[PDB]
């Protein structure tokens, strides 16, 4: 069971108002801590909901994040929801974009996707 | 309250073998559901640990992915461990190199990273 428990999962970003403005502001993540690295150089952004961590780094040296094909490595971030239909009216509301709402192939549950200010997919799942 | 809870995290891999290798074999991730996707083509892969989720695109299709610099999107994954040294020790007799012990720079607690057949970085944290 050494694995068993995520501790934080880490987003590369490209503008820290756009990071606030989304994750904090919108999403509802609260400030855990922020710090700026010189050396590296960028800002080290920790955030909280619930019992889980997200860690952003941000900084305008990271290209774009490959598409047609995606590369190796995480690819998506699936939130599980309770009711799919609310949770896309509040981000359309906050001017979030949502895909055509479709069930999942092997499943059959709702799922849609959003995308971060970067084009990073975000899943919403029942 | 909406966002509180990870389904799972994606993962694109390059190759079958080595994904039951690592993250089946040596993580003790349980298998969920496995099936084709002729379309697309690519194996999806669903594992689950304890009431984590995976969910693992395998496909010859993807390129490296990027570093140096790493690009916009998911950059980590982070485990929460509670006694590191044996954590290292159970990887390191599987194979899988962990780099040298550090403290987290603004938390004081212990961390390392060790890396998925596609050198995807997964972290240990205290």
């Known amino acids: ?4 428990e995520i501790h934080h999962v880490a987003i590369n970003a490209s503008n ?13 993540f609260e400030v855990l801590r922020e710090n700026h690295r010189p050396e590296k150089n960028d800002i080290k952004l920790d955030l909280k909901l ?6 952003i780094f941000i900084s ?6 490959p598409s047609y094909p995606e590369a ?6 699936a939130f599980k929801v309770e009711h799919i239909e609310e949770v896309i009216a509040f981000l359309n509301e906050q001017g979030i974009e ?4 479709r069930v999942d192939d092997f499943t059959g549950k709702k799922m849609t996707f959003f995308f ?3 084009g990073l997919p975000l899943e919403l799942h029942e």
């Open 1 to 4: 069971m050494f694995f068993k």
């Open 16 to 28: 820290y108002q756009a990071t606030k403005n989304f994750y904090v502001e919108k999403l509802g």
């Open 50 to 55: 619930g019992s889980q961590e997200l860690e």
């Open 60 to 65: 305008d040296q990271f290209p774009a994040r």
């Open 72 to 77: 190796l490595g995480l690819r998506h971030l």
């Open 98 to 101: 949502t895909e055509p709402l």
């Open 116 to 118: 971060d200010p970067d």
